[PDB]
Amino acid sequence: VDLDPSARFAEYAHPERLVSTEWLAAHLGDEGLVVVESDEDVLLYETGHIPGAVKVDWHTDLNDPVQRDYIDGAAFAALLGERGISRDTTVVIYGDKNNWWAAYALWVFTLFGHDDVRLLDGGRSKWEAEGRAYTTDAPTVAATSYPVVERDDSRIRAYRDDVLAHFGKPLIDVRSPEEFSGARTTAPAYPEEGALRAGHIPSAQNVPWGKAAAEDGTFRTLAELDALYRDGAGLKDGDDVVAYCRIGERSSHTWFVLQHLLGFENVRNYDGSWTEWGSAVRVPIVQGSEPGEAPAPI
Amino acid sequence: VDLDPSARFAEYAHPERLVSTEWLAAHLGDEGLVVVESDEDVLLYETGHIPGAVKVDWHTDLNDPVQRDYIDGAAFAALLGERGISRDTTVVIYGDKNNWWAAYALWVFTLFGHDDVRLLDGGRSKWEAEGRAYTTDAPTVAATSYPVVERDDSRIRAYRDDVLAHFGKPLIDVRSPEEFSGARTTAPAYPEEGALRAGHIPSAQNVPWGKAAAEDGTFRTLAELDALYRDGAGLKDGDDVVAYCRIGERSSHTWFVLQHLLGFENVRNYDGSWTEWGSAVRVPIVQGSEPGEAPAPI
């Protein structure tokens, strides 16, 4: 299944990671293509979704049911086969909130080493605004076989003890400035994603995740994104960059911007994020909207 | 300042760690004695407190104001000097909820290597029930000098990574059975001490902390405590025992039972507790009222 030649994506480091609404519309039904809805609000799928599209539910499908971790490769294989996805399938993911969760799903696929995963620029917003068709029909899929591969946390995921040893290397905190400063422990809309303590990781640069998206829901031009991350947050070629929100689901979008649109080679998602960090014992915290000086590597 | 010869304390491993209401009443005003109120409800002090008694407020006095850790030895020295406590002072601590917080304060003193700290058996309850006098007078204290010593976390405190390496060695979870089982993430009365996930550390034995206390607020007889911890939770001589609640403040009472009343030589408080554990990434959790099989040391 082919690539989108849109001049807009061509400036980006990995244009192959993006498809337009017009490309996907032209490609609906193609053999080798499966469309996945990945929404923060999992109930949107049933309101209307892109024809042939399947749903991944972050509450039930992507997380261990009891323990705080992503599923293993057996459960991932059963998830993807049930949805007619094979190892070689081109997967295009779109969803609500400007592909916030679409990016998170893309990130989980990458842990499992699925190569051809792509975001539908503008997600549900831009499909809806261009008046393209939804269906409420439960799509009908022939089950396939998907290989059982071991999950790879090496390249794109950061644990707590990795972030403690990271000081002197750049940190992006993608949370509202009020959470950044420690004025709130969490966003108003998410009381259940609070922590004991308030502030940010010392030396973290506040880049709320929404700034990487235009009003239409598409990713900003490379130049605008260069302004934000290179000039604004002080990232340069070779930097080992860790991004964090409250939960890893919410820091996946920025991960995707840094790794696939700006082409930073070493980009890790700290999924523990503030829900872990603000409840952990004897981990560095500062308050105020100043990044802060980093302490000694722990 | 002398020891309480009460026959009741004499069976305990460290009788010197306990004083009765009748002993303290006989000893009020003695040079070398300072009484400390340590309450979960810090406002009780102002309702009426033991004459000459000072207050330690766990919200403001014992914790770093921003970061999740206990104060350092400079702030501890200033706390104790301000209250007329010198290195050689006998400190007797009492408070509400059957000395729940009194034990927590005793635990913080021990981190700072203060030797003669003692609990008033029965705390505020038993002082009140025997109709002994309170005052609402802000007591008046000559400031003393207290040495600056480095805080010792080696002997009585456990961090997360210590508990991950602890499997195959005994764990006491002192939380309500409903939190133990994962039916609730927290106790009804403490919504702000929840976690993302619910259950207990696999192989942990549920011994709610209240069972070590009689209805009067005194510690149970050694035999009753032997029933609970030795027979019930399967502790034997030489065991490295870690106890945990939601926060370390609440697991200090049990620590004090295991270390000073039963005389277990190696007893650590995991202060991170469930607020840390139930929000940490990729740490073992089980549900149900069965302890569970331990996994491999992490």
Residue numbers in the entry:
A (entry chain A), B (entry chain A): 3 to 300
Question: Any passages from the paper?
Answer:
Sulfurtransferases, also known as rhodaneses, facilitate the transfer of sulfur from a donor molecule to a thiophilic acceptor. Each subunit of FrST comprised 11 α-helices, two 310 helices, and six β-strands and was divided into two distinct domains: the N-terminal rhodanese fold domain (non-active domain) and the C-terminal rhodanese fold domain (active domain).
During the crystal structure determination, we also solved another crystal structure of FrST, which belongs to the I21 space group and is annotated as FrSTI21. The overall structure of both structures is almost identical, evidenced by an RMSD of 0.284 Å (Cα). However, when FrSTI21 could closely resemble FrSTP1, a distinct conformational difference was observed in the 8α-η2 loop region at the top of the active site. Volume analysis using ParKVFinder 3.0 revealed that the volume of the active site in FrSTP1was 8.2 Å3, whereas it was 12.3 Å3 in FrSTI21. The tetrahedral sulfonate or sulfide of each substrate was positioned at the active site in a similar conformation and interacted with the side chains of Glu181 and Arg248 as well as the backbend of Ser178 via hydrogen bonds. The benzene ring of benzenethiosulfonate was located between Tyr192 and Trp211 within a possible range of hydrophobic interactions.
